[PDB]
Amino acid sequence: SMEQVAMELRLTELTRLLRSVLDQLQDKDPARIFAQPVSLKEVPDYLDHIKHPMDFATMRKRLEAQGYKNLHEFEEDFDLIIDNCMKYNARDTVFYRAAVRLRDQGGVVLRQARREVDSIG
Numbered sequence: 001s002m003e004q005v006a007m008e009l010r011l012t013e014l015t016r017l018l019r020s021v022l023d024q025l026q027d028k029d030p031a032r033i034f035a036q037p038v039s040l041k042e043v044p045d046y047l048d049h050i051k052h053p054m055d056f057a058t059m060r061k062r063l064e065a066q067g068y069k070n071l072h073e074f075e076e077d078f079d080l081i082i083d084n085c086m087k088y089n090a091r092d093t094v095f096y097r098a099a100v101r102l103r104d105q106g107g108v109v110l111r112q113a114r115r116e117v118d119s120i121g
Contacts, residue, residue, distance in 0.1 A: 014117070015066050018074050021113045022063060025078060026056050028105040033098045034081050038088075049088050054080035071117045075110060 029035065037055045038046050046053065059077050061067075068074045085099035 010121075011066050011069070013120070014068070014070070015063060017113065017116060017120075018063055018068055018071070021074070021109060022056070022059060024109045025102070025106045028102050028109075029056070029098065031094075031098060033095060034085070034102065046088070050084045052080055053084060054078075056081070071114060078106065078110070 026035070034056050036057050038050070038053055040046055054077050059074070059081075062077070063074075068077075082099045082103045085095055089095040089099075
């Protein structure tokens, strides 16, 4: 139908906007701490601690498959990155501190993304 096409074009444009958001968030992780999944070879008990692991490569795969239907879903995944890290790692670690900086710097990006998503529809 023409409606399904129109819906598909909306999703494609949302995907375009979320790709730009993702790139901007990932720039706030210059140490690449959050770039890839926590390795289960290196942290064999990780899944005993963290039930829903997340990282930027995993988000990117979902994004390029047009797997985010709205900004809320995308934000959920970004928040898992931060929140997983802040539980697994202690406050006095470079990992925890990286997550805090990512959260703080990403807030600004996500604030305007919400306005853009609502604005453009």
